[PDB]
Design a protein around this ligand. Structure first.
Ligand SMILES: C[As](C)(=O)[O-]
Ligand SMILES: [Mg+2]
Length: 189
């Protein structure tokens, strides 16, 4: 079954720090019977969009911990490096080891780096913000606020925002999660 709350979720955010492109997961043709034409997001749609702008993606980081959504060969056949980066499960935010893995990988790679989880907000924003602070010397306040504007409403799990502030700023200054837009729950019933 297609993931819940995916049909209404924007396919991509604006690029962050001129380097990262936040995305929801693509869904290959295997799901076309569950997804109307106007809502599809096959891997070909992403590479065709980049080609239309004469932009290359150097690497696509998949944070979903699954191979059921789409075929990684649809990305690699276009010359984009593909990495499946396993993140801590059980709803927990990425560990320090996961953030180090992410940083080690992205620092080797102008071209964009695509980053996606299932929906493109929490694991995706967490790792992008961690990279911006540890490698690009941004403040965590700036990283979180920029991700929220680029991919609204940004990270929305309160524990993720608190853990970023614990690692990189003052935990007492962590913002509460944003109020969510009405599209988030259109499919609940
Ligand atoms: C992005 As919806 C919760
Ligand atoms: Mg195919």
């Amino acid at each position: 079954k297609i993931p819940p709350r995916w049909l209404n979720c924007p396919r991509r955010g604006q690029p962050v720090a001129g380097r990262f492109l936040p995305l929801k997961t693509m869904l290959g043709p295997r799901y076309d019977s569950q997804v109307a034409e106007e809502n599809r997001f096959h891997p070909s749609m992403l590479s065709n969009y980049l080609k239309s702008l004469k932009v290359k993606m150097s690497l696509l980081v998949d944070l979903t911990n699954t191979s059921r959504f789409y075929d990684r060969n649809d990305i690699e056949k276009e010359g984009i490096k593909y990495i499946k980066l396993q993140c801590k499960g059980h709803g927990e935010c990425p560990t320090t080891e996961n953030t180090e893995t992410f940083i080690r990988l992205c620092e080797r790679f102008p071209e964009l780096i695509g980053v996606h989880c299932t929906h493109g907000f929490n694991r995706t924003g967490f790792l992008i913000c961690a990279f911006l602070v540890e490698k690009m010397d941004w403040s965590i306040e700036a990283a979180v606020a920029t991700f929220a504007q680029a991919r609204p409403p940004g990270i929305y799990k309160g524990d993720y925002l608190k853990e970023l502030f614990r690692r990189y700023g003052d935990i007492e200054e962590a913002p509460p999660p944003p109020v969510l837009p009405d599209w988030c729950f259109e499919d609940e019933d």
